[PDB]
Design a protein around this ligand. Structure first.
Ligand SMILES: *[C@@H]1O[C@H](CO)[C@@H](O[C@@H]2O[C@H](CO)[C@@H](O)[C@H](O)[C@H]2NC(C)=O)[C@H](O)[C@H]1NC(C)=O
Ligand SMILES: *[C@@H]1O[C@H](CO)[C@@H](O[C@@H]2O[C@H](CO)[C@@H](O)[C@H](O)[C@H]2NC(C)=O)[C@H](O)[C@H]1NC(C)=O
Ligand SMILES: *[C@@H]1O[C@H](CO)[C@@H](O[C@@H]2O[C@H](CO)[C@@H](O)[C@H](O)[C@H]2NC(C)=O)[C@H](O)[C@H]1NC(C)=O
Ligand SMILES: *[C@@]1(*)O[C@H](CO)[C@@H](O[C@@H]2O[C@H](CO)[C@@H](O)[C@H](O)[C@H]2NC(C)=O)[C@H](O)[C@H]1NC(C)=O
Lengths: 388, 394
């Protein structure tokens, strides 16, 4: 006899268009071979909604394409999980957050950017918050028919930044005779679109000096996957045109250290570009900006995320009554907000990485699971307790 | 050739203020006035320590503590005169004292324009139309009113038709946006505090309403409000921008200082909530803290932390005024400061820094050279305050 074990866990987030639908597969092994059950993560096994959700063979949670008119929050905006069960015990998979999106019109805008002659400028493509999870910038274009793409800086002046903005170096009066528009792509429909307004730089020739001034609204804490490229903006306008330096606070201290620039880590004006993120790049960054009148600064936190995995030591044990049983969950990833245990699909209230039963009983036989979580993600491991 | 009484060190009777901001057409008078026996000399220094020269037409030191910045032509701006922190230095035979810093900022009258763009919102949600003012005039310009193409006019104060509110921060708040709400275009009126000029936005904004089919948990934006410094006694509005379908609800908490624990904000007379916006009237220092907006809906939710500091004017005071001490007996000065934040304390003796940052100063054993004036300086980011005291030999 062997308890269930997942062979294929459903992914964590599945987002899809109503025209595309969604197959989600859950595969499990055991001896006897286990039954698969889908549940809402309110605990309840899920029904079939003809046309909308059909549990199939032998995973297998299918969402067929549907009409706007048949959208249903209860089915289509939902967190699910997979439950594999046999005589020996049950295991739950991680959560599967299901988001079906009815394909709808939107439009990105580019507005006027005001800047002091000689400063760098950042033109932003405005995307409404309710498509921003799905829409991203593919390219920039001007009325003079030039086209800018992510990659390298053009003519020492134009760079399309990782976060999709257009960065322009050393803005002069001649730069006001240009109008900019972005191209956006929606990842669920694959549709692309030119922005519905276009923006211009309005340049001031200043007479007075002015210390550097940064905006009221600042980038909130970023979460970036390992091996990805990151750009941190340091918006500032000053006269004379300022200098910019970046730091990282030593983690949990009030001290900071200059960022070192190389191959991998580059600074374009005041923008820090970090290629190939490793978890160690996480931290609290400070941009200090300066000219002969004075200085200002803004902070920006970054977490470099790494995918969770867990494994319990040992994968199985046979323990006498009422001797102790000990399970140790080992995991990998960044960040780890919590560790949680289950027994035959239910919670046990125990959030330390090591589980100890002091003296085993009849009812302790079954499957145990460690779940590790951070706010975008989860990983489970399972283990088997038998009675001597 | 002459004075009576014991010599008394100098002491400021009129301290110059901290920031004077002024247009090129107005100019600036800054007055420093001090006391002592005998009767002290007044010298203006730049805040690298050097005593300042006259620049005819620009900077003239006058009778009888007065630094004067006459009205001047654009062509005549000199950053060295016009963008500068000064101090007042007052001296007599007995000793010397330096005033708190005096940040001087002359600003040449220049054209700017505000803008108001398209705002995209889910029907049924609230919306916040913003007046985009250019960073480099934003210290001097702010919103005075909102106006519509159907000729309606909204002022700071009270809600209109329970629907439109001009937030104390200048944004126009609108409740429960409906499709009919897309046939309105909005402009801001802004006022420049140094020229007193008023203008309307160069561009007008509109609402673009999405009639959504799929549900969406609440979504907050990438860029969020950085830490805010509000003067005591002022009104404050904190925003929680979020769009969601259904229409989400909003709740405000405040963290217990230096813990991970929050408490619900208690809404009443003086603290109110419009949709997701928190309004704090008549701010006290105690209102300072880390605040958290939770936002919700049957699909899931989100949140935005914002830090508020309510600031209070800094003032310092030494105990005593003056003491006489025999040689090899210790002397003791204690600074009593009020205000919010204090970031730092420091000390000087006869205009020079002594490198000592604790509220109470102690000379272990008084020598000949220790006679004279001693000063505490208490500063934050935006402000400074000084105190003085007189040490005599017995
Ligand atoms: C999913 O929803 C979309 C949007 O409601 C449907 O697409 C519409 O299809 C009609 C023709 O069938 C077009 O004329 C419209 O242009 C589409 N609307 C928009 C705004 O995109 C789509 O067919 C639905 N998918 C299904 C039923 O499989
Ligand atoms: C560049 O600008 C910054 C102003 O933000 C200066 O850094 C500050 O320096 C003062 C002391 O002179 C400190 O008390 C502040 O805390 C500093 N801010 C921080 C934490 O960066 C800096 O002095 C300027 N560069 C120079 C040396 O001219
Ligand atoms: C301060 O500078 C402003 C701008 O240069 C001056 O105002 C201008 O005055 C000229 C004539 O003197 C006019 O043609 C402009 O239309 C004005 N423009 C602005 C921007 O107001 C002002 O006179 C200066 N202060 C002085 C000379 O005392
Ligand atoms: C609409 O969204 C918000 C997002 O927070 C949800 O509120 C969460 O409330 C539960 C209460 O037990 C907490 O576990 C969460 O921690 C809250 N927020 C977070 C991320 O910490 C809520 O799920 C949504 N709908 C409602 C009202 O239930």
């Amino acid at each position: 006899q062997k308890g269930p074990v997942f062979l294929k866990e459903p992914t964590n987030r599945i987002d899809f268009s109503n025209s595309t639908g969604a197959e989600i597969e859950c595969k499990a092994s055991g001896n006897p071979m286990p039954e698969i059950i889908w549940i809402r993560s309110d605990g309840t096994a899920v029904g079939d909604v003809p046309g909308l959700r059909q549990i199939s063979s032998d995973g297998k949670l299918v969402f067929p394409p549907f009409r706007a008119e048949d959208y249903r929050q209860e089915v289509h905006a939902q967190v699910y999980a997979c439950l594999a069960r046999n005589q020996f015990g049950s295991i739950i998979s991680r959560d599967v957050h299901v988001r079906a999106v009815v394909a709808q019109y939107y439009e990105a805008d580019v507005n006027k950017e005001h800047v002091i002659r000689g400063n760098s400028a950042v033109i932003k493509c405005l995307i409404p918050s309710f498509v921003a999870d799905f829409v991203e910038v593919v390219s920039w274009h001007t009325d003079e028919e030039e086209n800018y793409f992510p990659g390298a800086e053009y003519d020492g002046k134009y760079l399309v930044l990782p976060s999709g903005e257009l960065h322009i170096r050393e803005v002069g009066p001649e730069d006001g005779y240009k109008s900019y528009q972005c191209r956006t792509k929606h990842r669920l429909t694959g549709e692309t679109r030119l922005s519905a307004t276009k923006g211009r730089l309005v340049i001031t020739e200043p007479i007075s000096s002015s210390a550097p001034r940064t905006p009221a609204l600042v980038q909130k804490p970023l979460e970036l996957m390992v091996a990805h490229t990151i750009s941190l903006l340091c918006p500032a306008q000053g006269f004379p045109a300022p200098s910019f330096r970046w730091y990282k606070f030593i983690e949990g201290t009030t001290r900071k250290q200059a960022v070192v620039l190389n191959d991998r880590v580059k600074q374009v004006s005041g923008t820090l570009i970090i290629k190939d993120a490793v978890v160690e790049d996480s931290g609290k960054y400070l941009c200090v900006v300066n000219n002969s009148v004075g200085g200002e600064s803004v902070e920006t936190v970054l977490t470099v995320t790494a995918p969770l995995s867990a494994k319990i030591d040992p994968p199985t044990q046979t323990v006498d009554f009422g001797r102790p049983a000990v399970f140790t969950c080992q995991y990998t990833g960044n960040p780890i907000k919590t560790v949680s245990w289950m027994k035959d699909g239910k919670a046990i209230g125990h959030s330390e990485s090591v589980l100890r039963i002091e003296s085993v009983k009849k009812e302790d036989k079954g499957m145990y699971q460690c779940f590790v979580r951070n706010d975008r993600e989860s990983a489970e491991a399972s283990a088997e307790l038998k009675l001597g």
